[PDB]
């Protein structure tokens, strides 16, 4: 929906006379703001348990910041998405420095490659792959080789003026 934040959302399934202190279910929701986060919490909770926003209450909502936002991680991401003709689980791998950045990349990639909009995607799990050689996608593995270097051929410089007097070069 936007540049994502991650929230813990804890809801209650409001207490009654028979059942005081209900079971306090928690979810990790990727959303651009707390309103969407709570909406998503109620969506998934209605998918899982006999509850709705009218019969429950949000006990807490807290942004979870990346523990180490400046270290590059490999993430395994399990998603479930609706295609035009069915539902499918897929596992992908994303290299990024935070869970929110990885999830933004994942949503972009799903929309780009499967035309799956936000509404059609469920993030089943996002997990750091602690040990390389447990990374099982080539498009991520190729960036985990020793002494990785690569050039950037054909550099295109953006001109600030309409006309140039130089016939530019793409060297880099």
């Amino acid at each position: 929906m936007a540049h994502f934040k991650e929230y813990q959302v804890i809801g209650r399934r409001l207490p009654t006379e028979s059942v005081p202190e209900p079971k306090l279910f928690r979810m990790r929701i990727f959303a651009s703001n707390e309103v969407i986060a709570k909406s998503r919490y109620w969506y998934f909770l209605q998918k899982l348990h006999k509850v709705k926003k009218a019969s429950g209450e949000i006990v807490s909502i807290n942004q979870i910041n990346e523990a180490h936002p400046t270290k590059v991680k490999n993430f395994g991401v399990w998603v479930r998405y609706d295609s035009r003709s069915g539902t499918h689980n897929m596992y992908k791998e994303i290299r990024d420095v935070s869970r929110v950045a990885a999830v933004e990349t994942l949503y972009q990639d799903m929309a780009a490659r499967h035309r799956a909009r936000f509404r059609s995607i469920h993030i089943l799990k996002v997990a750091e792959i602690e040990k390389t050689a447990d990374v099982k996608r080539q498009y991520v593995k190729q960036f985990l080789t020793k002494d990785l270097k690569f050039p950037l051929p054909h550099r295109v410089q953006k001109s600030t003026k309409t006309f140039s007097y130089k016939r530019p070069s793409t060297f880099y």
Partner: protein, 197 residues
């Protein structure tokens, strides 16, 4: 920023160049385009030939001399793109179009003038490497332009003359650079460097 801007059309992505030039004329800038035969169009030569043949079949059925006129020369193909992007049926569009000249090769008025390029229309900067592209001269010859050989011959002659001119200019520039390198440790030069010059 000049009274006349001469664009060397070589490798310039006819549509994007036409957009730049149309806006320039409508903003009141005089534009001279040279070497229209060396313009580029994205897509295979066969693709662009098929597109021009689709253009060619369009004609007023009861009198072909009334129908759309299919100009074959590369300068007129580029002119067609520009005119389609100018409001040419108004007096303002007419004035904008009179602010424009397009040539195959670089004729004598402009072969001794500075040519500029348009980076946002340059093929090497815009097209993804490996994308196939067409050259306007080849397309024009295939659809009936008659002067590819004459233009190429005159361009080779002009390039010989211009290379001689540039050899002389390079020698003189080396002389001037040496004379500026000397007297670069002078007090005046040190003060100029302090001021940024």
């Amino acid at each position: 920023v000049e009274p006349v801007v001469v664009i060397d059309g070589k490798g310039h992505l006819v549509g994007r160049l036409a957009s730049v030039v149309a806006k320039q004329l409508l903003n009141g800038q005089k534009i001279v385009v040279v070497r229209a035969e060396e313009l580029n169009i994205s897509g295979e030569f066969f693709r662009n030939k098929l597109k021009y043949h689709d253009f060619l079949r369009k004609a007023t059925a009861f009198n072909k001399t009334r129908g759309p006129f299919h100009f074959r020369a590369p300068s007129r193909i580029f002119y067609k793109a520009l005119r389609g992007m100018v409001s040419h049926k108004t007096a303002r569009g007419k004035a904008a179009l009179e602010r424009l000249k397009v040539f195959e090769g670089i004729p004598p008025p402009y072969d001794k003038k500075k040519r500029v390029v348009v980076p946002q229309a340059l093929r090497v900067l815009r097209l993804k490497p490996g994308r196939k592209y067409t050259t306007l001269g080849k397309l024009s010859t295939s659809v009936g332009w008659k002067y590819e050989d004459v233009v190429a011959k005159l361009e080779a002659k002009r390039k010989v003359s211009s290379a001689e001119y540039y050899a002389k200019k390079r020698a003189f520039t080396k002389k001037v650079a040496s004379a500026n390198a000397t007297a670069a440790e002078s007090d005046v030069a040190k003060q100029l460097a302090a001021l940024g010059y």
